[PDB]
Write a protein that binds this DNA or RNA. Structure first.
Length: 50
DNA sequence: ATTGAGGCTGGTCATGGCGCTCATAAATCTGGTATACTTACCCACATTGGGGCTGATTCTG
């Protein structure tokens, strides 16, 4: 739910993008892995107050 | 500057705990009726306004 009124489910997103649900899942997992890769999001890691 | 393989782009098949929906049920929430006789509670100032006089110009017997 980023920069929009509401979020969209994975199936509606796949339908809008003409991409299967599993391919959408794999692309999301690749994006999450790339964000978990180091040398990035250092301020995001610093955003924890514990 | 080609043709022989690895990494990575397309989709397969269910899969699995989660959430919305149906139904049961005792606890919680509402309305109702009692026929010996019981009858009235328990500080000091300053200002404006209302009501009772107080003359003072108009009229009277």
């Amino acid at each position: 739910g980023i920069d929009m009124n509401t979020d969209y489910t994975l199936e509606e997103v796949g339908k809008q993008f003409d991409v299967t649900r599993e391919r959408i899942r794999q692309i999301e997992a690749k994006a999450l892995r790339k964000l978990r890769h180091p040398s990035r999001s250092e301020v995001l890691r610093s955003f924890l107050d514990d």
